[PDB]
Design an enzyme around this catalytic site. Structure first.
Site, PDB file in Angstrom:
ATOM      1  CB  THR A 146      48.314  87.508   7.515  1.00 22.01           C
ATOM      2  OG1 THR A 146      50.291  87.022   7.726  1.00 22.01           O
ATOM      3  CG2 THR A 146      48.072  88.498   7.414  1.00 22.01           C
ATOM      4  CD  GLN A 147      42.449  90.014  11.951  1.00 24.68           C
ATOM      5  OE1 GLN A 147      42.501  89.287  11.983  1.00 24.68           O
ATOM      6  NE2 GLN A 147      41.778  90.946  11.692  1.00 24.68           N
ATOM      7  CG  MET A 160      52.327  84.808  12.458  1.00 24.04           C
ATOM      8  SD  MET A 160      53.185  86.084  12.125  1.00 24.04           S
ATOM      9  CE  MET A 160      53.184  86.840  10.532  1.00 24.04           C
TER      10      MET A 160
END
Lengths: 233, 140
Positions: free
Chosen positions: A1-2, A107
């Site tokens: 996740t970013q 993800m």
């Protein structure tokens, strides 16, 4: 996740009788700050494909590196790398579509919305979309982010369905693209006046246009507008 | 005694590696290939033994490309040469990924040199039965 840091706005595209037209502005936004102005967001792959990427710029430059490696890898042990076994727009898209979905499933997505524009070896027009979720779709007109709300309504007035494609010339198609870029400059706060335009035709080939500007703007009516309701002067 | 030629990484009484020397015999048996350095480039040429009329002309390509600026040609065991080019292509891609610029020729020469030398250090691996002529144009 970013999270996206340096971003590029809309990528607009449509297909006409002999090929496709794709356009994107040269801006690299840092939040509200319009930080970079010399950013090319249309990447030509070979002479029959142009890849328009919006969203995260660092992720765009990664995809840009992947496409250059794909050309290098295709040329390996291939005597027909410039002929029959050349990279098709459909091969380039499917590869990217596979990567985008594999990244979201882990993800760790590539924060981009990508349109692959080009002409197939048999003369067919190719125009397909892929985003960070791996969602893929084809339409006579395609636009990413902000253009999906403003440019699409304008471009669908020219080509509403499949039967309108052979009736649309390069002159009418390019005019609709240039007009849409002006409208995006009017209402998108993360848009630039300077943009690039690419035409892939089954006859004239690839035509890459750089340093284009939004012209013929209407601003004269602003002098008559004073206040916000009751102010007269 | 004897038997110094049975295993790869074994030194003989005179400081020689016989398994490597036997790999050279496989090269000497193979098809001849050449390379010529000119004033601003390099030219590679190779013989192609037509075994029978059944071989499709201009199809069985022997010369291989590494990256987009390096050309490789080899003599001896063709499968061994392909394996070396496969490694070289990975090695060139690893260089371009980290350093952006395409791999220099002397840089690429050492990368294959270290990889082939590695196959002389263990008895579990076989030396390459190929002599590879390669090159291209870089910064200088």
């Amino acid at each position: 996740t970013q999270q996206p840091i340096v971003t590029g706005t809309s990528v607009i595209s449509m297909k006409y009788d002999n090929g496709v037209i794709i356009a994107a502005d040269n801006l690299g936004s840092y939040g509200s700050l319009l930080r970079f102005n010399g950013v090319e967001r249309l990447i030509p792959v070979g002479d029959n494909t142009v890849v328009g990427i919006s969203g995260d710029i660092s992720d765009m430059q990664h995809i840009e590196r992947l496409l250059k490696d794909l050309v290098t890898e295709n040329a390996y042990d291939n005597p027909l790398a410039d002929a029959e076994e050349a990279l098709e727009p459909s091969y380039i898209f499917e590869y990217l579509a596979t990567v985008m979905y594999q990244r979201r499933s882990k993800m760790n997505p590539l924060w981009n919305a990508i349109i692959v524009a080009g002409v197939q070896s048999n003369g067919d027009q190719f125009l397909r979309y892929v985003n960070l979720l791996g969602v893929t779709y084809s339409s006579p007109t395609l636009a990413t982010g902000f253009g999906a709300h403003m440019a699409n309504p304008l471009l669908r007035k020219v080509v509403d369905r499949e039967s309108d494609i052979p009736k649309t010339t390069v002159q009418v198609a390019e005019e609709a693209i240039v007009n849409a870029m002006r409208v995006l400059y009017y209402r998108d706060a993360r848009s630039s006046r300077n943009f690039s335009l690419a035409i892939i035709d089954k006859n004239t080939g690839l035509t890459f246009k750089k340093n284009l500007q939004v012209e013929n703007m209407k601003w004269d009516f602003a002098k008559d507008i004073k206040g916000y309701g009751t102010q007269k002067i | 005694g004897t038997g110094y030629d049975l295993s790869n990484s074994v030194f003989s009484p005179d400081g020689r590696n016989f398994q490597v020397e036997y790999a050279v015999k496989a090269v000497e048996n193979g098809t001849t290939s050449i390379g010529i350095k000119c004033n601003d480039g390099v030219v590679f040429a190779v013989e192609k033994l037509i075994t029978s009329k059944l071989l499709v002309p201009q199809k069985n390509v022997k010369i291989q490309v590494v990256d987009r600026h390096i050309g490789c040609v080899y003599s001896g065991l063709i499968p061994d040469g392909r394996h070396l080019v496969n490694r070289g292509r990975e090695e060139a891609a690893s260089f371009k990924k980290l350093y952006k610029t395409p791999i220099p020729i002397p840089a690429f020469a050492d990368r294959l040199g270290q990889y082939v030398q590695a196959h002389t250090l263990y008895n579990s691996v076989r030396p390459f039965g190929v002599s590879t002529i390669f090159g291209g144009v870089d910064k200088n």
